[PDB]
Amino acid sequence: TEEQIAEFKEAFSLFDKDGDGTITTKELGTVMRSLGQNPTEAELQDMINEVDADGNGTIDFPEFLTMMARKMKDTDSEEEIREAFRVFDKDGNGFISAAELRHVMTNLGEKLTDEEVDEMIREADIDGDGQVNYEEFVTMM
Ligand SMILES: [Ca+2]
Ligand SMILES: [Ca+2]
Ligand SMILES: [Ca+2]
Ligand SMILES: [Ca+2]
């Protein structure tokens, strides 16, 4: 993960406009505006605060790094949950049905009856439409 780190250093350099090794609300502003966005000073301070740990008002690399790291983990986890969902969502329409769940499960070594998969679907069917969508899937696993 020694390379991840080099890429994070480069990402950070893009924010650190003058290269002192800290990111200010001013520099963040410049970056945001170069992206077509126009956050207020209040918004810039909020964005800085979400990463600025010791609260001295700016973001150093160790804080940036610590942030990017956590962010990537959740990014990867998120993708894996979605990959799992896709496997169960046989016809890929965005909803896991009892029939698909039964089918995929058996083809994965897990044999269940219609009654059992029904109970699993129900337990996760928050919006009550009869199948498990992605959001419900996440809330359940
Ligand atoms: Ca700077
Ligand atoms: Ca700081
Ligand atoms: Ca489906
Ligand atoms: Ca549902």
Curated annotation (Swiss-Prot):
Gene Ontology molecular function: any one:
calcium ion binding
Task: Supply the SUPFAM superfamilies for this chain.
Answer: EF-hand
Question: What Gene3D superfamilies does its record include?
Answer: EF-hand (1.10.238.10)
Q: Which positions bind Ca(2+) 4?
A: D125, D127, D129, Q131, E136
Q: Which PROSITE patterns does this chain map to?
A: EF_HAND_1, EF_HAND_2
Source taxon at top rank: Eukaryota
What protein name applies here? Calmodulin
What gene is behind this protein? cmd-1
